[PDB]
Design a binder for these strands. Structure first.
Ligand SMILES: [W+6]
Ligand SMILES: [W+6]
Ligand SMILES: [W+6]
Ligand SMILES: [W+6]
Ligand SMILES: [W+6]
Ligand SMILES: [W+6]
Ligand SMILES: [W+6]
Ligand SMILES: [W+6]
Ligand SMILES: [W+6]
Ligand SMILES: [W+6]
Ligand SMILES: [W+6]
Ligand SMILES: [W+6]
Ligand SMILES: [W+6]
Ligand SMILES: [W+6]
Ligand SMILES: [W+6]
Ligand SMILES: [W+6]
Ligand SMILES: [W+6]
Ligand SMILES: [Zn+2]
Ligand SMILES: [Zn+2]
Ligand SMILES: [Zn+2]
Ligand SMILES: [Zn+2]
Ligand SMILES: [Zn+2]
Lengths: 269, 269, 253, 263, 250
DNA sequence: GAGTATTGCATAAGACAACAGTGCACGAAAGAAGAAGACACT
DNA sequence: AATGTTGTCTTATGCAATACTC
DNA sequence: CTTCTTTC
DNA sequence: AATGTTGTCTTATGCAAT
DNA sequence: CTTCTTTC
DNA sequence: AGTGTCTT
């Protein structure tokens, strides 16, 4: 049956259940036949990726431009968020230039303070010599991303949800439909980012401004296990941050801290 | 604090968790406040009951065109599947014409038999008076689809993902990567259709041939309950088909048969 | 019924038994209608070539007939090659399944190594012989006459005198196969499709066992519905139907 | 839209509710327009409301219209529930002309349960008895001109006459309406008095006749915590329900928890 | 049920769908009844496009000409009689069918001198109706003639029908076609015409548009299991969309 | 009074999203409406 | 050089407190 | 006889 | 007029031999 | 001192 | 000297 099944899959590439039933082969073997085939293994998962987040506020920032035509003429919205505090700062601009990046960054620093590093995309206004000189002056490390995959920029584009879903609702509330009047744009914006920092975020236990100015940093965390490349669970780690998607775990022997998917962490003892 | 919370949401449109905590209101009330707001319409009521299925073999067919450049210059693949037996029939054509549709349906009839009804999407070939007058002589019911949002012919469009992949796997297996030579295209077709229809489809207990020529039609099914618009569970129904996604259920008092989502059916007693 | 049957024969030229059954007409009338018309398993297969000047440019027609179910499969070609035999055979196996053996003539297209290894990978026996023996090559020959007759008859019925353009050829062969396969032939009271597949509609489910309160597995049940969480199984004797957890059901034998 | 509405009434003499809706004019203005019209002050008014639905009890009579000569006999039939007027012209009041008129009224409004007529000669004949018996519609005679048996059609006749007269005076027909335009004129009057709103109601008469198509009803819990009657639910999907107010037909969506059966 | 259907067909020769609904009979019996009798592309909105055509029937002498107009969407029909072929007859018949059904938006006609005359030209413009003059129109003519033969031979009229008997049979025909069936359908032409309109206003909905956005401003007119018919409040355009693509407005 | 249906309420339990600068660009196919020359109108 | 995000949306259980039905 | 339009 | 669908895909659980 | 390649 | 539907 094993050779007959191999020949059958060679010619027809029959799935494993059919070969297992037809030739009376156990499922592990039939699956082994599909696995050993080069063309039929065209769907392995091989998925991973952590945003990542910072262990404390004013450490990791993310910034990107988004287009909200309601703010016309200055329809470009530069959005920035701290990964630890989840607090949002936004300004309006008419053109996406490095001047707008250093201006917006100047405002966000004027509100929340100076961050350790800002994580942007591969845009031309962020990769300009002038921007590198600006962050060279303010001492902020620069981290770009994949060319076209904003998944790593997730928790800033996630902000672009609120900033665009809150501006819609608040603008419709004051009776503005096609374009927000220029006299009330500042009020709209101020109330907008006012509602998203001093007040909780749905099921969030604290407010983003409280998580900003009064963050929770564990000195030494509780012990956890992590699932390592071979699929095994390894003791000897402690967790410092455990969020919804991902957790930050620290190795006990070195104090190195890494971010891993939640599914790959379980309590140690 | 019902009015205080309402005012807070009026101005800032604060979520229910925040208003419930801030104004000490129970959950149901705060949620009612968010619900009662028009510009915060959640909504999210989109009726999920959606069922494109038929009862018996040769009763309801699905037919659509798709592009696979491996068969060029005749790369146009016409696909027709029987919704009850899941038996696929595909024919290659250089250009999508009503004559090509009548040729395809002529072959699928020459293999499976004359169907009672065929459901397609409203294209140029199907909505022509010529194809209409062709189904006229053969007595086959014609059912078009929504202009653009083709999610109902899915069990044929999904068939393309079942089809074209089995093409590639058979093409790469024979050393043909870019375009399959004209001499072996038809053999590729026959080998694909024989691999799909004459063997189990993954977890399928019967083969499409065993499901077509030896189908299983229940004289009368076991009793079930269905969840009705008000959310209640109503007795007095019997289930005739219970698949992975959807179920066909029959009303005991009238013998009227309707299709409903699996999640909306449970055993009666 | 008389006019409906006449129209049916006009278009498809269906034999008299099929028209008699379909339109509920007695034998003498249906047969008289055929007279009044001017133009009127899986054990061993017989494959042969036949040329039809009416299917130009690709006028070669490959025919395969099952010796037990009398099915008919046809594919058009432009020239007889060793590849054409394996292509047509691939189509036939795709249609009606893999047979056990095929009988052909002493032609080079059937006896070449290119065809031999093809029949070897699929496990199909082959026995050649005299080109036209009565053991033999007689049945597939009758299939060729029937097929060519039906081709010229349906063609001249739709208004195609001698040459059918390249567009409607596959449609012609399609309708021909439909008539000669899904309808009764001559005086035979069953269709070749029914002779090949035995289309028995299953009135119930396959047999299963259910785990009873004492933990034992009890035979004598068949399952009719398997929904989320639970399964409906029917007792074959009393026809009582009960619902039980999926985990409490396993195949019987 | 004041001038457009004025022109509309000039030609068709449409009631105020219809002009108010068609040209988006407030009620007080439209009513002032109807007041300023001379033939809208004759008037007469046919609507003057039981609890039975359409096709329950009809009324049928004959009236004279010398302008419609030679076919000067107008057979009028109106519904006592939906208030729909159907009329055809004849040369003489016969027993077969009532079968023709009623046969016409069947093809447009369906078959009623009964038809109340007077003691006229053509209503108690043998031919009318055969036709009425073939169509299975009940019939009751009565006194010609009392206050209960013959109530609405008495006004319906003057409605029709003082409608065709006015629509004809607008085209230049004063002494006698020509024969080639008899059915055309009559048709214009019917389309003016059936498909359009007349008086002040919540639905147009043509809608009044064709809505046996509705809620359970339901009650909804209003902001003050009270339960308010007067709504019907038309759609109940996952999470929310659409309910319609019976007095206005306004439809709003509310949470499922806020709905319970009314009575 | 068998006797009720047989009597109904004996007198009116009613099609099988109507007898099946009226007497609660399955399709096979009613169809068998229609068989035993010897004398026996979809549209999107009513009152929008009509199709008028002339037809001749010498049995209706001296006014042998007829005139049939059909609402193509709601499967409606209306017929009148005329003596000669002129323009005032066309304007007369249209003026009647308007009162029968309601002011249509456009009416398709045939090639003819009566439809192009000056008076007929500006008559439709006076009522604000479009003229196009554009296969399946003549079905209503034979539709009318077969039913006329059915009821005429039902009451015993074989020869030429008197002038004082034509109208009653016309109304008997139009009633015998509008209220019963169209031969194969599931809903009477009246509900296809008169009762999508009686719905005052549906509930508000949003629809997901090509760009993925949700657009306010629509009301739903028909809500079935799979699909809903929704009407734009600003334009009255009606489209059919998947249930999953609709959510409540406010 | 005592058993019980039901209301109040709180999580939790699967999920659904849309965030990515704008999406409209082109093409075939089948069917319907607008435009230039010709020979009647007057 | 440099990784997918949470903010909500409905319904499904487990336990106090009215409002009922004997 | 062109474009113009609705779908795939 | 006319309804998001399944065949894989990985990693966790119940019946019988060294 | 204009015209391409990158990315958003 | 003005235009008008029909053919395509
Ligand atoms: W070629
Ligand atoms: W070639
Ligand atoms: W070729
Ligand atoms: W030759
Ligand atoms: W030759
Ligand atoms: W020859
Ligand atoms: W020859
Ligand atoms: W030759
Ligand atoms: W020759
Ligand atoms: W060729
Ligand atoms: W060639
Ligand atoms: W060629
Ligand atoms: W060739
Ligand atoms: W070729
Ligand atoms: W070639
Ligand atoms: W060719
Ligand atoms: W070719
Ligand atoms: Zn393989
Ligand atoms: Zn709000
Ligand atoms: Zn014949
Ligand atoms: Zn007036
Ligand atoms: Zn009949």
């Amino acid at each position: 049956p094993l050779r007959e099944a191999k020949d059958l899959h060679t010619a027809l590439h029959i799935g494993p259940r059919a070969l297992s039933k037809a030739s009376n082969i156990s499922m592990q073997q039939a699956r082994e036949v599909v696995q050993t085939c080069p063309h039929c293994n065209s769907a392995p998962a091989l998925e991973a990726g952590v945003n990542p987040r910072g262990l404390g506020p004013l450490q990791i920032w993310q910034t990107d431009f988004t287009l909200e035509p309601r703010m016309a003429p200055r329809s470009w919205l530069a959005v920035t968020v701290d990964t630890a505090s989840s607090a949002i700062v936004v300004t309006q601009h008419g053109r996406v230039t490095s001047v707008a990046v250093q201006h917006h960054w100047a405002t966000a620093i004027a509100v929340m303070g100076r961050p350790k590093a800002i994580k942007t995309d591969n845009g031309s206004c962020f990769t300009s010599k002038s921007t590198r000189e600006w962050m060279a002056r303010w001492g902020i490390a620069h981290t770009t991303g994949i060319p076209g995959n904003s998944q790593g920029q997730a928790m800033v584009e996630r902000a672009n949800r609120m900033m665009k879903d809150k501006i819609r609702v608040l603008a419709e509330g004051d009776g503005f439909m096609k374009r927000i009047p220029t006299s009330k744009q500042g009020e709209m914006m101020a109330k907008a980012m006012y509602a998203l920092n001093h007040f909780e975020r749905g099921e969030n236990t604290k407010t983003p401004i409280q998580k900003h100015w009064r963050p929770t940093v564990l000195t030494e965390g509780p012990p956890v296990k992590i699932r390592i490349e071979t699929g095994e669970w390894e003791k000897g780690w402690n967790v410092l941050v455990w969020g919804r998607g991902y957790a930050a775990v620290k190795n006990r022997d070195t104090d190195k801290v890494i971010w891993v998917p939640s599914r790959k962490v379980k309590p140690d003892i």
